[PDB]
Design a protein around this ligand. Sequence first.
Ligand SMILES: *[C@@H]1O[C@H](CO)[C@@H](O[C@@H]2O[C@H](CO)[C@@H](O[C@@H]3O[C@H](CO[C@H]4O[C@H](CO[C@H]5O[C@H](CO)[C@@H](O)[C@H](O)[C@@H]5O)[C@@H](O)[C@H](O[C@H]5O[C@H](CO)[C@@H](O)[C@H](O)[C@@H]5O)[C@@H]4O)[C@@H](O)[C@H](O[C@H]4O[C@H](CO)[C@@H](O)[C@H](O)[C@@H]4O[C@H]4O[C@H](CO)[C@@H](O)[C@H](O)[C@@H]4O)[C@@H]3O)[C@H](O)[C@H]2NC(C)=O)[C@H](O)[C@H]1NC(C)=O
Ligand SMILES: *[C@@H]1O[C@H](CO)[C@@H](O[C@@H]2O[C@H](CO)[C@@H](O[C@@H]3O[C@H](CO)[C@@H](O)[C@H](O)[C@@H]3O)[C@H](O)[C@H]2NC(C)=O)[C@H](O)[C@H]1NC(C)=O
Ligand SMILES: *[C@@H]1O[C@H](CO)[C@@H](O)[C@H](O)[C@H]1NC(C)=O
Lengths: 52, 110, 126
Amino acid sequence: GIRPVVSTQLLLNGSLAEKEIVIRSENLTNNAKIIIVHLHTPVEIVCTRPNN
Amino acid sequence: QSALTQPASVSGSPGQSITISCTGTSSDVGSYNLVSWYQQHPGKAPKLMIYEVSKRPSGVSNRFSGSKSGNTASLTISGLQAEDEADYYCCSYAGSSTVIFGGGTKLTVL
Amino acid sequence: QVQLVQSGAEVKKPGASVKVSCKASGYTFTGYYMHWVRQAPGQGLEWMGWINPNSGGTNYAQKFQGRVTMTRDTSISTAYMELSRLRSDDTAVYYCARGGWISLYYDSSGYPNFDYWGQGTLVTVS
Ligand SMILES: *[C@@H]1O[C@H](CO)[C@@H](O[C@@H]2O[C@H](CO)[C@@H](O[C@@H]3O[C@H](CO[C@H]4O[C@H](CO[C@H]5O[C@H](CO)[C@@H](O)[C@H](O)[C@@H]5O)[C@@H](O)[C@H](O[C@H]5O[C@H](CO)[C@@H](O)[C@H](O)[C@@H]5O)[C@@H]4O)[C@@H](O)[C@H](O[C@H]4O[C@H](CO)[C@@H](O)[C@H](O)[C@@H]4O[C@H]4O[C@H](CO)[C@@H](O)[C@H](O)[C@@H]4O)[C@@H]3O)[C@H](O)[C@H]2NC(C)=O)[C@H](O)[C@H]1NC(C)=O
Ligand SMILES: *[C@@H]1O[C@H](CO)[C@@H](O[C@@H]2O[C@H](CO)[C@@H](O[C@@H]3O[C@H](CO)[C@@H](O)[C@H](O)[C@@H]3O)[C@H](O)[C@H]2NC(C)=O)[C@H](O)[C@H]1NC(C)=O
Ligand SMILES: *[C@@H]1O[C@H](CO)[C@@H](O)[C@H](O)[C@H]1NC(C)=O
């Protein structure tokens, strides 16, 4: 099940890792490749609004 | 959109428990848990009794307690004395940031 | 400690505007709401709207929208009420009450927690 969420930073609802933090990157030498960090434990986030 | 329902007056002997209840529309009391109780002396400003449906403030002894059951909110007074001569009011959140008030119950001692 | 004092009594003819002040001292009044209520002699309590003394935004209840104006003065620590078009049914006593806490993250305006009250201003119409 792939949930097509749209987010720029702080990747929302999805599959976690399995045993530790896993870091995905292409080269790790040039500073133009987006290093991707796959977390192991989630951190809760909640957001609200006023009443239209 | 009218005021909350409340009886005219209640009475009881000293040392006897008394219950004052308010029945309101489900948009006012049955949905939100914001209910407060308000006694006053004749000729004086009223003072706050119960914060939410059941909460105790500072400076008030443990003789007043409140509860809610569906559309009804009630107040229980334990240990009625001669200082219970007052006029009790209901008030609640009514939606659209408007607060409505009840009619008034006058308590007499025996 | 903290006190909420008001102005003296006033009598007006039908067709005038009454100004009632409420001075709060002993605490930072810009961080708390302010509610005004009415009490006819012998009847219960009627609720007029609230004022938020930070941004000056006001709300009013039904049967009052159009003839009440609610302003504030931060520097001299007073809260004002301008009720115009007085009738014979407006003979009552007016109270100013301190509501919830201005919290910037949730709407605590309609919370009915009036801790500290004014001594009242007697306004009668003949
Ligand atoms: C996302 O996260 C954010 C977190 O950043 C969330 O925002 C937070 O939301 C909570 C509500 O869930 C708010 O809590 C509320 O805070 C107020 C303010 O209390 C503070 O100030 C009190 C006043 O004293 C200081 O302030 C004046 C300013 O003029 C100074 O002059 C004074 O000198 C003082 O400096 C102070 O008394 C409070 O102390 C209490 O808390 C501290 C914590 O550190 C304790 O140690 C103390 O012992 C003491 O317990 C505090 O510093 C509270 O007043 C609110 O409580 C009232 O409201 C409750 C709900 O209505 C009610 O159940 C309570 O009984 C209480 O009721 C009171 O209401 C009126 C207040 O005067 C009166 O009628 C009466 O006194 C009555 O008792 C509540 O705790 C946070 O403030 C808020 N954070 C910020 C930064 O605003 C946000 O909600 C989250 N969003 C989500 C999850 O969606
Ligand atoms: C947030 O804003 C919305 C705006 O719609 C508020 O909803 C409105 O709440 C009022 C409460 O009185 C509703 O009025 C009631 O309508 C019913 C309809 O049958 C009527 O029977 C009642 O006598 C009363 O007049 C109003 O309808 C409702 N709006 C809608 C579209 O349903 C809501 O209350 C606000 N939230 C808070 C916490 O204030
Ligand atoms: C990218 O990886 C290749 C293979 O290891 C390496 O030769 C190259 O130098 C890397 N790019 C940069 C900019 O270092």
